[PDB]
Amino acid sequence: PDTFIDERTLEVFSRALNPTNPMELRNLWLGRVEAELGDNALRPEYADLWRRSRVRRAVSVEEVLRSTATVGMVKELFNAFFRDDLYGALSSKRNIILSSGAVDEDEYGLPAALKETLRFALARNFYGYSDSLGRQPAREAVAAMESVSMQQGHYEAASVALTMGATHTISSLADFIFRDNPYADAAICAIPNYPPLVQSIAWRHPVLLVPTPSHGGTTSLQALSRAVTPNTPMVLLQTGTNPCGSLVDELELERFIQSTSLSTLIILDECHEWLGAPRHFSPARQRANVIRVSSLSKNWSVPGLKVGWFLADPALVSRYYEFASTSYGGPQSFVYTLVEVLARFERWIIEGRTSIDQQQLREFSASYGLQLGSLSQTYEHYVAERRAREQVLLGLRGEATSCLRRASMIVKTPQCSINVFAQIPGSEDSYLSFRNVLRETGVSVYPGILSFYLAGGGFRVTTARKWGDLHRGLERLSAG
Amino acid sequence: PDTFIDERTLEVFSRALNPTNPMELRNLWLGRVEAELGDNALRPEYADLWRRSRVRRAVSVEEVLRSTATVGMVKELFNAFFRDDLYGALSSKRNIILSSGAVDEDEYGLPAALKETLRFALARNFYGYSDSLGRQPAREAVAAMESVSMQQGHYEAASVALTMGATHTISSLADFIFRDNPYADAAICAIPNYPPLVQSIAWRHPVLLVPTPSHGGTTSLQALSRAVTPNTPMVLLQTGTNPCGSLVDELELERFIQSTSLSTLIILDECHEWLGAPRHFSPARQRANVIRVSSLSKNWSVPGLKVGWFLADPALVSRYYEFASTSYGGPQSFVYTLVEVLARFERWIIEGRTSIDQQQLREFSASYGLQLGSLSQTYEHYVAERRAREQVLLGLRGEATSCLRRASMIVKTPQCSINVFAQIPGSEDSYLSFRNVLRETGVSVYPGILSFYLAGGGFRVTTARKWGDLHRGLERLSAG
């Protein structure tokens, strides 16, 4: 099963001087961790802080899950992990990094066609000022690509907003939504989730954290449906779950969406719905209160470009125009061509097109100066590259799961994306497990506490790495 | 002189049903404008709305300048101008656009060296995840480049934060500053200013608008100093003024900065301090409460790349790390190389270096694989290109000013940047002047109301265009 909160979590919240202080909670958590790192403590000050601590109150599960200090403390542990733990004090060139959560952009980066579009946009000086929601051809191509994948329904360009990645998108959406919001109930965040998104939402409104447990690669929205209220302002839900790799059922997602008031906005984070996820979307996903957020960071492995978009009702997009104008003045024009060339290409794959004729060449404007033969060859090569990347990534994920299971670890079977959730038997602290594994074998893993798994000792392993790095890391991990 | 507010402005605020409604104020403003467009009214509905309007209250100058509805109304007029006025109903392919405020990226775009760095970063897959404040070499180069231009003092890489442009930077700073802010007085915005920045600040805190009048190309901070209070949270001030092109005096800016409490943050918007601006900065500009914001949008003509940075106290930057992590997860890594290659190059120009030896080649890392001869030739060509661009732009600005004066217009002499503020004699409404000029001569100009000049009929002319476009526009403008 999945463990989300127990008494071991309540201990830290009951021993703190002021529970509403995220930094004190982070210090107590790290102090406990370094207390069971007796001899190998990286900082004995925090261990001493934990030793002097005393229980002074009674804390319940509901209080922890309804507290903004929980989100703050997880965000502080997230910050420490990257700042002064793995790339700080314990930084090394022999450490094998299996905790990024990102595809290795050297082995599997942007395909040649999209790189060529970026080069072309650079040569054409396509970096002038752009509209707050993006240029029209890119939005039209994105609308067609999103429409081709639905069971029923259709998207127009008026329902597409181009943004600078998912983190910025949910941050901007939370800020834009919570200006004039009559509803006073807490925004609901389904856990496990990404700490930056939950923190950006909790910046604006109180947050209720609702576990969304997984069983056999299927994500259960049973408790989430009960949690949602007719006065809920918004609900952030991840369709492809991180870190375990479980996937929501389309019928269950449809029923949950239909069981919600039109006053409750639903943000569907779909950044992990690839590499095995079936993409036949119910029409309920096109409802008037549903916002579908996607980015290019994972599926195309370009986090540094910061390109994404969201789909919503046309009125909401028209209102978001002004917010985007005031906040950042629109997205990068320099990537528009890429987006367009991506979307049409993607559509011609879903449409089952092996080849391209003159009809698909009129999709693009004549200013680009495209020829039929060059475009056809480019599309063939792009299809081949995407297929090869998908096959290799699936093979790597399967091999990593098999090796972790053979090394006597409790491993959840991933249904999507590139991450595998594993646990060493008998382990009760995920961050302690990170410290122990890093010191013992020199391999960095991603503790589950940073995915809002407040209980248990499981960690996340990223399998979309170079074969050499993954093989050496798995050998060291199984040896220990 | 400069006119900022008169009775003609108070009329609209006194005839509105609810003064706190920005949309009603925009409708009344447009209705008046289309009322003096008797036969040529683009929308008679707004004219009818204005005709039925009646005075129902007394409005003062202080009420208008202290109201958030003024900022909202100017933002709405700004939105209308681009959405349903110039690129909407009145869109045409014969209109000559002289109102963008941006350098023509076709004739005067990014230099070849920076394009080559972008191409190299693309070839190296330099689009992985990056730190919230940027990568270290880029920050170090930016710190050195900023330090070389000060009379006294020095900047370290810890005082540099890389961001995605000035609009996003001031929006993020306004959000980040006004979370835990004990001071309840209004944030002070110096006008003329950019409506998106003022609106992003007014999103978070009440705003007081303070005129900063110009006389002979010199911007006067006389009333701004009186306006500032020891409990002022922040002050947004533009060192190179838009649209007139006036420049603050370094001694006056130093005195104003020194006359401020350390509790008052000062955001210096320096995006227009080029093309004639002397860049010998006083040490007061390096104070602990001064934030210096800059972008590449104007000086290098790349608004679509969205690259910028700000300089602040190291503690403030260290605090901004977490905000950047939560909001957007850091800037684009894909541009880091460019920034670095820019900064060092810029420094070698300020240092008066004609040539480059092996000592400057160790500035960059050996991973880039740089050779001495290629780097030397590239630097020579970059210096030549920057010099030529500056000379051409200065010539164009001077010619535009001379032509506008010869066509019997009251024209302020620009001391910096690329814009010229002109006024047709006898004109009392800037947006009416925009409509009249666009209909009569087919040339679009930028009304001064969109620069927070609530009175007068002056408009802004952008002279950093192709010579053909500027020549034809000036001919049509002088003919009429």
Give structural notes.
The PDB classes it as lyase. The structure is a homodimer of 480-residue chains. Helices cover 45% and strands 12% of the residues of chain A. The first copy, chain A, is α/β, with parallel strands linked by helices and 480 residues long. Chain A has two domains: 7-97 and 419-462, no CATH class; 113-350, Aspartate Aminotransferase, domain 2 (3-Layer(aba) Sandwich). A seven-stranded mixed β-sheet of chain A has the order 2-11-10-9-7-3-4, sandwiched between helices. A four-stranded antiparallel β-sheet of chain A has the order 12-13-16-15. In chain A, β12 and β13 (419-423) form a beta hairpin. The longest helix of chain A has 35 residues, at 372-406. At the A-B interface, α5, α6, α8, α9 and α12 of A face α5, α6, α8, α9 and α12 of B.
Let me know the number of strands of chain A. 16
In CATH, the homologous superfamily of the largest domain in chain A goes by the name: Type I PLP-dependent aspartate aminotransferase-like (Major domain)
CATH T-level topology of the largest domain in chain A: Aspartate Aminotransferase, domain 2
> Based on helices, strands and strand pairing, what is the structural class of chain A?
alpha/beta
Which radius of gyration of chain A do the C-alpha atoms yield?
23 Å
- Largest interface (C-beta under 8 Å): A-B, 46 and 46 residues
The termini of chain A sit apart by: 25 Å
For this structure, the quaternary state is homodimer
CATH class of the largest domain in chain A: Alpha Beta
Proportion in β-strands of chain A? 5-15%
In helices, the fraction of residues of chain A equals 40-55%
Strand order of the largest sheet of chain A: 2-11-10-9-7-3-4
Number of helical elements of chain A = 17
Looking at the structure, what is the overall shape of chain A?
globular
Number of domains of chain A: 2
Reported for the largest beta sheet of chain A, the result is: 7 strands, mixed
Which CATH architecture of the largest domain in chain A is right? 3-Layer(aba) Sandwich
